[PDB]
C-alpha cells in the first residue's frame, strides 16, 4: 500500500505529499539530489516519508532502480515530474525531451519490474494539453475533457509558450498510447489531471523565497513590483488553487469512478490587474507599495476568453473548488506575513 510520487520537491507535489500523509499513506517521493532529499524530510518530519534519488528523468531507464528496490510495495503512482521553465533556451532539451522520456521511463519501469502490482497511475498532464494556446482569447471555442491541443511536432517550437504546452501534450499522448498498446500486459489504470495556472500558498512557509516557482512568481513579482508598472488588464488565462489540485491527485487513485478520465481543473478567468486588485482590496493599509487598483478589467466587463466545460470533472470530483479571491489572498498573505509586513 505505498505511493510513489515523482518530482516531490515541486510546488504542487509538496501539497500532494501533505495530503497523502494526512491520510496515513506511506509515501516515496523522488528528488533530484540528496541535498533536497534531506531538506524535505526535516520539513515533513514524518516516519512514513522515504526518498529515492532520480537526478534526471530523461536519462536511460531513470526509474528502474526504484522498482527493483520498492517493487512489491508500490500500489499507486503519482507521476508529477515535468519541467516548468518559462525562460528555457534549449526548448527540445529543456522541456520536450524530459516531459516525454520521463513519462516513458516511468511507464516502462512499471512494465518491467511491477506489471501486476501497480494498481493506479495519476499523471499531472495540463490545461496546456487541452487548450489551444493562441485561441485563449476566443470565446467561440469551448474546452472540455475530450479536447486536445492540436499542436504538431513541426509548429510546436514557435516560441517558449507553444513549446512547454506541446511538451505537456506529447507526453500525454505517449501515456495513453502506452496504455492502449499494453492494456493486456500491465494492470494499472491511468488517470490524467489538467490544471490551469496553479496559484496558492507554498506548502511550507520557509519556501517563500525571493523568487518562487514559475506560476506563483507571477503573483510574487506583481506584489513587489514598483508602483507605476504597466499591469495587463486584458484576459490572460484560467487558474486553479493548488490545494484543489493536491486533493484531486489523491482522489485520482482512490475513487473507481476516476479511471480513464482526463480531469480538467479550471475555476476562473483572470487578468494581471484582477490579481493586483486583491492586493489593494484585502490589504488596504499597504496602498502605494505595489501597483494600484483598477476595476475596468476584462473579467468585470464579463470577458473570460474561451469557455470551460468542466462539468463532468466537477461532478466526478464532488468537492467545491476554491474561489479566486481566496487563492490570491492566501498566496499573498503568506508572503507578506513571512516578510513581516502584516
Ligand atoms: N505550476 C502550474 O501552474 C502547473 C499547471 C499545470 C500543470 N503543472 C504540472 O505540475 C507538475 C509540477 O509543476 P510545478 O508547478 O510544481 O513546478 P515545479 O515546482 O518545478 O515542480 C516540478 C518538480 O519536478 C522537478 N523536475 C523538473 N524536471 C525534472 C527532471 N528532468 N528530472 C527530475 N526532476 C525534475 C523539479 O525540480 P527542479 O526544480 O530541481 O527542476 C520540481 O521539483 C508538472 O508536471 C507541471 O507540468 C503545473
From TrEMBL:
Record family assignment: Belongs to the NAD(P)-dependent epimerase/dehydratase family. Dihydroflavonol-4-reductase subfamily.
Residue sites binding NADP(+) 2 per the record: 9, 11-12, 32, 36, 56-57, 80, 168, 196, 198, 215
The protein, known as: NAD-dependent epimerase/dehydratase domain-containing protein
All residue ranges annotated as the NAD-dependent epimerase/dehydratase domain in the record: 3-255
A molecular function (GO) term: oxidoreductase activity, acting on the CH-OH group of donors, NAD or NADP as acceptor
Keywords: Nucleotide-binding, Oxidoreductase
Record-linked InterPro entries: Epimerase_deHydtase (IPR001509), NAD(P)-bd_dom_sf (IPR036291), NAD(P)_dehydrat-like (IPR050425)
Positions contributing to NADP(+) 1 binding: 7, 9-12, 32, 36, 56-57, 80, 164, 168, 198, 215
